[PDB]
Amino acid sequence: MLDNPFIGAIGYVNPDWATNVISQANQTADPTLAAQMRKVATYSTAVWLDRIAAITAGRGLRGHLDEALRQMQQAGQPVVITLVIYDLSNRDCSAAASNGELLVAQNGLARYKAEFIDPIVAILSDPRYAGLRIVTIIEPDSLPNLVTNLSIPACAEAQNAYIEGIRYAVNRLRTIPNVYIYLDIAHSGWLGWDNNFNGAVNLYTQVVQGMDQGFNSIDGFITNVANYTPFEEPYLPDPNLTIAGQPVRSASFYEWNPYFDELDYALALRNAFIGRGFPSTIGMLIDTSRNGWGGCSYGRCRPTGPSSDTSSVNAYVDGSRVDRRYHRGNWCNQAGGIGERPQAAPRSGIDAYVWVKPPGESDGVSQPGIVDPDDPNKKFDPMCDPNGQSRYNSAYPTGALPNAPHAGRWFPQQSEILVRNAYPPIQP
Ligand SMILES: [Li+]
Ligand SMILES: [Li+]
Incomplete structure (x- = not known):
């Protein structure tokens, strides 16, 4: 097992995400921006397994792995594919509701093991995939809740399911020698x-x-x-x-x-x-x-030096920070920019910069009253309300972009902003 699976491998390119990017490029008036959008489609993004159905829906987990095999054969180089394992019971426990399908009180942990982890592990165990490097990102937005959010019943009730679920996932994945495991x-x-x-x-x-x-x-x-x-x-x-x-x-x-x-x-x-x-x-x-955080949004452009305003801490910091968000907890559909392209070992201790969230996919629908026909569990979250305040500190707006589709769906308006605001700028 390699010390770093990103060294000496090329990143998997998800053709389903890339198709969305290219379609967006073809709908882009600005020829420069369109060429940049086109280039973005060539980069490597992670495949999210965020529900049981994701294992088999569309090309499915096997389909992505088979595609990775094809890219490996074509390139004559090892391919590293990143998978996000994201279906814990009482998922995203600190949110008033989550898009996650499993609940601790409804046999969540048992189903997490038997219907989610087990079939994934069975697929990843197929000897056909032995030549790939498979990176598994384990359960975003889980354990940190047990540090700060235990006053919230859904988190306090989820403690053992998180601990036992993550232990189960890792224990089973460790039986596969080409799987590289990173905890969120x-x-x-x-x-x-x-x-x-x-x-x-x-x-x-x-x-x-x-x-x-x-x-x-x-x-x-x-x-x-x-x-x-x-x-x-x-x-x-x-x-x-x-x-x-x-x-x-x-x-x-x-x-x-x-x-x-x-x-x-x-x-x-x-x-x-x-x-x-x-x-x-x-x-x-x-x-x-x-x-x-290139380009301009939220009333500022990217700083090019420490602020000349040293009159107050807030004025100085707000003029010096590249993160332009109104509040650090604003996580939904932000007018940011694409960051460093995926690259191996940029500094000692860092295995890679990676694109896990695929740029252009929504963080959530922007208003209530609209059900996702393809996922009955997806729900509006007020942090995605362009007209609302942050739930973490109501003195600040959410900063969320309007007209957003349900989470994971292609978001044309944000995709253009993200590319226009890329830093370093996209080289077409
Ligand atoms: Li390592
Ligand atoms: Li620093």
Whole structure:
């Protein structure tokens, strides 16, 4: 088993996502933007298994793996395909409701094992796929809730199902020698504060220690999945820098969080886990699909230096940060930009920047009253309301784009914004 499956392999290109991108390009008036959209279709994005039906619907898990085999044969190089394992019972427990089909009180954990993990593992175990490198991102938006959100009944009730579900998933996947396993561990805007950071290190250490292979059960962690947090905040490199008698991390946008970006956060976690007994062979992934923050939106353009306004902490930080969101918890349908293209080992400790969330796919429908005919479990979330306030802090707008289709469906307007705002800009 490789130290890093992204070294010496080319990323899987999902033809179903790429078809949507190319269709968008053909509907794009601006010839420059259209050529950029066309180029985006050539990059590697992850295949999400977000419900039991995803295993067989359309080309299905087998179909994507067969396609990966074809790309491998054509390229004469190993292909690395990324899969997102995302169907825990009481999924996304801190949200008032989730699109996830399984509930703890309705045999959720048992069905997670028997109808979701087991058939996936049976497919991935097929000797036909032995030559691929298969990366599995384990359960976004799960464990970090057990650090910060246990006051919420759906999270407190989900504790064992999350722990036992994730242990089961990893234990079974570890029986397949070409599967590389990365646990999702949120992003800096969730677990950066000292108490959350230490609580997460404790929690994940306990979860992994209880797996069959202990600290050898996983290959690393991933941050920023489907989020927009920059990998680097180059004009705020020092969270303790004094402006107007106060450190810049005291700004309203950060609320004393010592981590402004995913590189610092991911590497700090990696060192902390190594300190707890994880082998130094662990590596971190960062989802850079939508965190470039080029172009202009939310009343600002990308900064090109520290703010000249040193009159207040907030003025300085707000003029210096590349993350332009109104509030760090604004996760739905943001007017961001595509980030760094997928690339292996960009810094020591980082296995790769990857695109897990596929750019252009919606984070959620933008108003209630509209049922998804193809998924009865998809539901409107107020964080996607373009006319609403953040639920995490109602002083701030959601920043969500209007006219969004249900989660996972192609979102023409956001796709154009994401490409136009790409950083570095897309090279057609
Ligand atoms: Li490694
Ligand atoms: Li930094």
